[PDB]
Design a protein around this ligand. Structure first.
Ligand code: PCW
Ligand code: PCW
Ligand code: CLR
Ligand code: TRP
Lengths: 175, 45, 268, 82, 50
């Protein structure tokens, strides 16, 4: 019925999680971007299959470049200096299917090498993880989605636990 | 009289405010970003 | 006595050197993983413990027989309490996986010093009570050997001496249980293979010197006491510090944030 | 010491030998100081301490895994081989 | 059976001998006792360490 922020709630191993989806706002990001300060982690999603898809429909903008630009803008905000990012590279089946039909070299002028999933994934990831510059305070966790099993929830739970532990140690001053 | 009623109402409001805040403090908040058609739907499901 | 004096001076020098390294590299992640303030307090207490062995050499005047034991007792209790508080706080931080907690004030920096003071108050109150009521004094014994005169101090209380030893031994024993609980902590925060060895060094030197104290009398008793004190202090210092000092000065590549991030992550 | 084969046996043997060395260096000063009936005692304490050390370090852990503790947990050959 | 089943028995017997050797020291010294104190301990301990 209502538009705007959508909230989903679930409990995993006695931890209560809250997730806010802000994709329906369609307004200036800066005005509402200072309201979300204080979150524990930021979940970020990227599709590998957009390398050879002109999703944007603009010749100048390729979906991968747009995703990289958005990730760069989000990661280096003044407010989110100390919030970690859980990066989810998604759709690894179709991407692996199309690599041999059209290699990864279309997106980047530099060669990925070998035209196969392991090498291609490494090049796309390294290129996404190098966008950050506050390496001292924030870190990125990367998981390739697995549909059948529950690796998706467990990875988020473990990442949140690690973030909480590292936050407490830093406050004590030990870390 | 009126001061007593106001004080009692304030103390009832304050007690409810404290406990609810303590309960909220025990939750983890996550922000889900992503351009549309990036598979956000699959993670949510 | 010259050898004992030289060894005490060397111990003081090495104690000062470790403190100088910690101050030069305070920012480094390895040094910051260990509690820096408690480290300084432990080093100062260790300097006091090493310097307290100089009261056992020379003519035993009355003003020395009262300060021979309590100085060492308080100095060693300070180190034990510092070690205990340093280990319990790391355990409290790691166990708190929960987002929120009531133990926020429990791990506060100021509370640590109060706990170290509470663990030495008992040793301070037995000493003051002992000195006020039945103080030690010097006496000359001509009975042992008809031809030679010896100068020694008589404590005047043997129950008071027993209580200090019992309290120190009790604290050393708890240092075993807290060392045992900490074996599963990650690297750069786990120290369980040194505390137990230091406590065992102390127990073996003192337990070994029981026969001599019960049988021998004369100048030898003081030499045995000095040797035991010096050996215990050296063992504690070495086990606690010389590993980290080596990693910091030699192999400096380890003192990097990436290493400590990789270390803490192994827990999850 | 790094090798994890057989319940960390190398680590245990190394820890046991250090106790022996510590016990015996501490013996020399005690012996010279004692004269009379207690000269004999300084030998029994050393022997007992060393014997209690070696046996406990080498066997305590395996005995727990075998009896008076979980059985069929790490008892399997799989656990001994690794 | 992963460990050697015979060296373990030999080591336990040697440790028993080492434990029992200390009993000879306690007691009024006699000619045969002092001749048998040291060698028993030495042999038993060497048997254990070996
Ligand atoms: C000359 C006369 C002296 C007479 C006394 C001598 C008696 C003989 C001494 C000892 C027998 C036992 C020796 C104990 C050695 C401990 C071994 C050790 O060091 O292993 C270190 C740590 C574990 O290893 P880790 O952390 O590196 O890896 C673990 C990493 N993970 C968890 C991920 C796998 O093990 C731990 O937790 C440590 C747990 C604490 C050990 C308890 C020992 C208590 C001994 C008390 C002696 C008191 C004397 C009695 C007085 C009576 C006189 C009449
Ligand atoms: C962590 C531990 C810290 C401790 C530091 C360890 C290093 C100390 C180094 C040297 C100590 C001082 C040197 C003492 C000389 C003065 C002695 C004295 O003055 O004896 C005076 C005369 O000589 C002597 O009888 C004999 C000298 C003693 C020889 C020791 C025999 C036992 C041997 C051990 C040797 C095997 C070595 C194997 C290595 C083991 C390592 C794992 C009189 O003395 P007395 O009448 O009062 O009693 C005498 C009581 N009776 C007779 C029972 C001794
Ligand atoms: C009761 C005391 C005085 C004598 C017996 C010593 C026992 C309690 C001590 C000595 C060596 C210790 C072991 C040292 C190493 C390890 C490996 C660790 O991963 C689990 C604990 C464990 C297995 C310890 C258990 C307790 C232990 C066996
Ligand atoms: N003479 C004391 C030596 C001593 C002084 N202070 C101590 C503190 C702890 C243990 C021993 C001591 C003893 O009987 O051993």
């Amino acid at each position: 019925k209502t538009t705007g922020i959508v909230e989903t709630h679930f409990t995993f191993k006695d931890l209560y999680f809250k997730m806010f989806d802000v994709g329906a706002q369609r307004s200036e990001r800066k005005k509402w971007i200072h309201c979300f300060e204080g979150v524990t982690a930021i979940i970020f999603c990227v599709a590998l299959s957009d390398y050879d898809l002109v999703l944007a429909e603009d010749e100048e903008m390729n979906r991968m470049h747009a995703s990289m630009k958005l990730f760069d803008s989000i990661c280096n905000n003044k407010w989110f200096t100390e919030t970690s990012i859980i990066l989810f590279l998604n759709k690894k089946d179709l991407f692996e299917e199309k690599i041999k039909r059209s290699p990864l070299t279309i997106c980047y002028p530099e060669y990925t090498g070998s035209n196969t999933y392991e090498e291609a994934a490494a090049y796309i990831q390294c290129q996404f993880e190098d966008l950050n510059r506050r390496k001292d305070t924030k870190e990125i966790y990367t998981h390739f989605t697995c549909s059948t099993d529950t690796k998706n929830v467990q990875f988020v739970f473990d990442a949140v636990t690690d973030v909480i532990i590292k936050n407490n140690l830093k406050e004590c001053g030990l870390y | 009289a009126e001061d007593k009623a106001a004080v009692e109402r304030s103390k009832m409001i304050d007690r409810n405010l404290r406990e609810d805040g303590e309960k909220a403090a025990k939750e983890v908040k996550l922000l889900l970003l992503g351009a549309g058609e990036s598979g956000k739907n699959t993670i949510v499901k | 006595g010259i050898a004992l004096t030289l060894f005490a001076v060397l111990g003081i020098f090495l104690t000062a050197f470790v403190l100088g390294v910690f101050i030069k590299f305070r920012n480094t992640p390895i040094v910051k993983a260990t509690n820096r303030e408690l480290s300084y307090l432990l080093l100062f207490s260790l300097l006091c413990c090493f310097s307290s062995s100089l009261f056992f050499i020379g003519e035993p005047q009355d003003w020395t027989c009262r300060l021979r034991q309590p100085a060492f007792g308080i100095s060693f209790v300070l180190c034990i309490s510092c070690i205990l508080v340093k280990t319990n706080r790391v355990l409290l931080v790691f166990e708190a996986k929960i987002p929120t907690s009531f133990h926020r004030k429990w791990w506060g920096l100021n509370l640590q010093f109060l706990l170290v003071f509470l663990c030495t108050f008992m040793q301070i109150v037995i000493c003051v009570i002992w000195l006020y009521t039945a103080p030690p004094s010097s006496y000359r014994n001509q009975e042992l050997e008809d031809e030679i005169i010896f100068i020694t101090c008589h404590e005047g209380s043997l129950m008071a001496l027993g209580f200090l030893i019992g309290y120190t031994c009790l604290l050393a024993a708890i240092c075993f249980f807290f060392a045992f609980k900490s074996r599963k902590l990650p690297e750069n925060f786990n120290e369980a293979k040194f505390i137990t060895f230091s406590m065992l060094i102390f127990f073996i030197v003192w337990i070994s010197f029981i026969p001599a104290y019960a049988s021998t009398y004369g100048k030898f008793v003081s030499a045995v006491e000095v040797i035991a004190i010096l050996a215990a202090s050296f063992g504690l210092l070495a086990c606690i510090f010389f590993n980290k000092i080596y990693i910091i000065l030699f192999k400096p590549s380890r003192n990097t944030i990436e290493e400590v991030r990789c270390s803490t992550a192994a827990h999850a | 010491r790094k090798l994890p084969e057989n319940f960390n046996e190398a680590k245990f043997i190394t820890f046991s030998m250090l106790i022996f060395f510590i016990v015996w260096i501490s013996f020399i000063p005690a012996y010279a100081s004692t004269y009379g009936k207690f000269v004999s005692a300084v030998e029994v304490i050393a022997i007992l301490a060393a014997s209690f050390g070696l046996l406990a370090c080498i066997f305590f852990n395996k005995i727990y895994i075998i009896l008076f503790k979980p059985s069929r947990n790490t008892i399997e050959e799989v656990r001994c081989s690794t | 059976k992963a460990t050697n089943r015979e060296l373990s028995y030999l080591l336990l017997f040697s440790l028993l001998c080492c434990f029992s050797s200390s009993l000879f020291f306690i007691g009024e010294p006699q000619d045969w006792t002092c001749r048998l104190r040291q060698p028993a301990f030495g042999i038993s301990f060497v048997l254990c360490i070996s």
